[PDB]
């Protein structure tokens, strides 16, 4: 129940002979490069969020591959790595490893996501809803009026293992992702977390 829409740089192209996005027949949800989606994740037993990175039309197939960049949710952070980074005198620790689990779980904003450079193929039948992913400032605006099921904030890209946090402007990332070549885009975001 999803349609494919192809356009030049602006107007649509007909079927009879270039950007791709998906449109839902039901309401008119548009999904394309830069949009974030909440996805059912059967293996994790909880939902995941991604930013769409490429709608690869697979002439290999006559089928559509929806590739996206994976967000981390709070519980996928490495709480020791996070603490040690943001407390420099906390690479010399003395606490139990489980204290760091309690501390992170208890103080983290559960709707703060962390970008990663890791791609996933997403299947449309697992799509739950569009994510509203805003930067740290836009998130101060909304504080007492956020919907914990749609509304998310991002401050960092980091490694898929939940460490090495680097400040990013998420709104700048969306615009970058919808401009440059996917392969170039992913490889650049991959370099953002390396010494």
């Amino acid at each position: 129940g999803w349609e494919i829409i192809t356009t030049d740089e602006q107007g649509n192209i007909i079927d009879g002979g270039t950007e791709h996005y998906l449109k839902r027949s039901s309401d008119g949800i548009k999904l394309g490069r830069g949009d974030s989606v909440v996805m059912h994740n059967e293996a994790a037993g909880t939902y995941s969020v991604y930013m769409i990175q490429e709608l690869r039309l697979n002439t290999l197939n006559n089928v559509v591959e929806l590739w996206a960049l994976t967000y981390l949710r709070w519980f996928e952070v490495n709480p020791l790595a996070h603490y040690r980074q943001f407390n420099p005198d906390a690479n010399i620790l003395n606490r139990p490893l489980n204290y760091y689990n309690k501390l992170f779980s208890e103080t983290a904003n559960k709707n703060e996501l962390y970008l990663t450079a890791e791609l996933a193929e997403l299947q449309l039948f697992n799509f739950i809803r569009v994510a509203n992913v805003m930067d740290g400032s836009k998130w101060e605006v909304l504080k007492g009026n956020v919907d914990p099921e749609r509304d998310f904030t991002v401050r960092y890209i980091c490694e898929p293992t939940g460490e090495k946090f680097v400040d990013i402007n998420i709104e700048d990332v969306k615009a970058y992702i919808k401009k440059v070549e996917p392969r170039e885009a992913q490889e650049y975001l991959k370099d953002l977390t390396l010494p």
Binding site: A43, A44, G45, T46, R73, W74, F75, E76, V77, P79, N98, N101, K102, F104, S105, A108
Partner: protein
């Protein structure tokens, strides 16, 4: 109370999944995907409630489990409340036996999906 990872809380002999805000069978195959070695080790040394002991209880399950009810999403379900305030399952048909002291009540509880697709309910007495 032990936070064996940022997602998983052990408290009151229950494993609590803090993303889903709900208890997990410690024997849930899904943990083979989610737990690290050291975290599985912790749980095995931890002495948890066996979810199988629930299987043929016909009424809901009363608990002293403060942390569990604090961190878990609850639904309201229709039950019969006795004179002692224990909840009992509603018979989905006429039961006939005079019980004037048992009354229909909408009570807060925590649903758990059992091994065999049977649903149980935990509540604090």
């Amino acid at each position: 109370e032990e936070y064996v990872s940022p997602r998983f809380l052990v408290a009151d002999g229950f494993l609590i999944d803090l993303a889903e805000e709900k208890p997990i069978n410690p024997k849930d195959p899904r943990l083979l995907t989610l737990l690290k070695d050291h975290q599985r080790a912790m749980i095995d040394q931890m002495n948890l409630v066996k979810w199988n002991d629930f299987k043929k209880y016909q009424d809901p399950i009363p608990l002293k489990a403060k942390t569990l009810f604090k961190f878990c999403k609850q639904i309201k379900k229709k039950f019969l409340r006795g004179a002692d305030f224990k909840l009992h399952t509603l018979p989905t048909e006429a039961n006939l036996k005079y019980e004037p002291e048992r009354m229909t009540v909408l009570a807060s509880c925590v649903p758990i999906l059992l091994d065999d697709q049977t649903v149980q309910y935990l509540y604090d007495d």
